[PDB]
């Protein structure tokens, strides 16, 4: 449905360009009556119902109507929608932590204890969703973001609800894409689904977040996939020596071919490794 059709300019004053994908750019921005620094996202549509550059309405209003439903901690929220001829601009809850994967970057990995702290953040963030029949599918380092790269202990967020889809029932359509290094087998092999899939991304992240070494990535695109499909991980010595067998067990049960036979949030949010 319609959102807002005017010139945000008379209401929002943009600024720095945070990030720009393939059909969008992220720019900070204040308001007129709040000074509440935000950042409108504009995603490039398609001139004609057959363009090759940008994205169609269905996906927009979709990512919108899927977002416009949320409200929870580690997951960005939605303020309003501002639409103009060229694009639909997402007035997202301003974030700036960027890639946790980066903040700690200079620091290779972390420390299991300090580690899980972050693990246990998304695990909680994804959860809310799961029980809401809305997997993400895109859960990848690159999306993970902190709310202040400065606060002593950071509170991450969740975004990029592109693949995200109501798994209520859904005419789980559109296929569309995923990244050659983290999509769950099912994706690699004729598009299944599942929030049980989100716990595959997550089983991944939790292994990288503590090792600085992708498990499947290969020299080439296709060649990698050849790695997910089969699920052929390996704890690298020089890369894991200082790792808790327990810690291991975790990720391990997360990199399993048959979905059902793979863990899930609930279970996962109680694994001995996450024993508060």
Curated annotation (Swiss-Prot):
Reported induction: Up-regulated following treatment with IFNG/IFN-gamma.
- The entry's active site is 138
User: Any signal peptide, and if so, which residues?
Assistant: none
Q: How is it modified after translation?
A: Ubiquitinated by the BCR(KLHL20) E3 ubiquitin ligase complex, leading to its degradation by the proteasome.
Tissue localization of expression is: Isoform 2 is expressed in normal intestinal tissue as well as in colorectal carcinomas.
- Domain named Protein kinase: which ranges? 12-274
Task: List ligand-binding residues for ATP.
Answer: 18-26, 41, 93-95, 99, 160
The record's domain comment reads: The autoinhibitory domain sterically blocks the substrate peptide-binding site by making both hydrophobic and electrostatic contacts with the kinase core.
Task: Describe its function.
Answer: Calcium/calmodulin-dependent serine/threonine kinase involved in multiple cellular signaling pathways that trigger cell survival, apoptosis, and autophagy. Regulates both type I apoptotic and type II autophagic cell deaths signal, depending on the cellular setting. The former is caspase-dependent, while the latter is caspase-independent and is characterized by the accumulation of autophagic vesicles. Phosphorylates PIN1 resulting in inhibition of its catalytic activity, nuclear localization, and cellular function. Phosphorylates TPM1, enhancing stress fiber formation in endothelial cells.
The family annotation for this protein states:
Belongs to the protein kinase superfamily. CAMK Ser/Thr protein kinase family. DAP kinase subfamily.
On subunit structure and binding partners, the annotation says: Interacts with KLHL20. Interacts (via death domain) with MAPK1 and MAPK3. Interacts with MAP1B (via N-terminus). Interacts with PRKD1 in an oxidative stress-regulated manner. Interacts with PIN1, PDCD6, BECN1, TSC2 and STX1A. Interacts (via kinase domain) with DAPK3 (via kinase domain). Interacts with GRINB. Interacts (via death domain) with UNC5B (via death domain). Interacts with UNC5C (via death domain).
Q: What is this protein called?
A: Death-associated protein kinase 1
Q: Which organism is it from?
A: Homo sapiens (Human)
Lineage at the top is:
Eukaryota, Metazoa, Chordata, Craniata, Vertebrata
By which gene is this protein encoded? DAPK1
